[PDB]
Structure 1
Amino acid sequence: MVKIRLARFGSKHNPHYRIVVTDARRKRDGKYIEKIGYYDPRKTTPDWLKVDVERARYWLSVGAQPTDTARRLLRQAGVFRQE
């Protein structure tokens, strides 16, 4: 099914993931359906994680299944927070 997962975009020893919505079957770095965020594991800048909850929620509402790390990040940005 369609997923919300991380696509690798940094450089050697300089990982920079790109949180994308893609079909489960594509290369992890292949053609995605939509970019809905980014994530710098090493937090090299204050802005090491953006998400756009609006969109993350649209895909979740239509099927998109996030990987474990994907939701960990989506949650950290309050995608599932309902308070």
Structure 2
Amino acid sequence: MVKIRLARFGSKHNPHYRIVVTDARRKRDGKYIEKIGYYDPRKTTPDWLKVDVERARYWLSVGAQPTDTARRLLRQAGVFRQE
């Protein structure tokens, strides 16, 4: 099915992912439907996790599954909290 997941960018010993929604069957680094966030696991900058929540929610509501690791990061920017 369609997925919310981490596409690897950046470089060697420089992981910088994009949080992206994409058919599960693409290659990891391949074409994707839409970009929503980016993530830098080493927090080399303060704006190291970003997500467009209002879009991630669109995508979650039309049946995209997120990766464990992606979920964690959407949770952290409160895609999941509902007041």
Q: TM-score, normalised by structure 1?
A: 0.99
Residues in 1 aligned to 2:54 and 2:82: alpha-carbon distance in whole angstroms? 13
Structure 1: distance between partners of 2:70 and 2:46: 20
CA distance in 1: counterparts of 2:74 and 2:32, whole angstroms: 18
Q: Distance in 2 between matches of 1:38 and 1:13?
A: 17
Partner of 1:6: 6
| TM-score, normalization by structure 2 | 0.99
Structure 2: runs of 5 or more not aligned: none
SS at match of 2:14: coil
Separation in 2 of the partners of 1:4 and 1:42?
A: 21
- Structure 1: state its 5+ residue gaps: none
Structure 1 residue 59, shift from structure 2 partner: 0.3
- Alignment deviations for residues 35-68 of structure 1 (CA, whole Å, 9 cap, x no partner): 0000000000000000010000000000100000
Identity percentage over the alignment? Answer: 100
| Whole-angstrom CA distance in 1 between matches of 2:25 and 2:80 | 26
**C-alpha separation in 1, matches of 2:28 and 2:81:** 28
1:7-45, Cα deviation, whole Å (9 max, x unpaired): 000100000000000000001000000000000000000
**Deviation for aligned residue 1:71:** 0.3
What is the Cα-based RMSD across aligned positions, in Å? 0.3
Tell me the matched-pair count.
83
Residue 82 of structure 1 and its aligned partner are, at CA, apart by 0.6
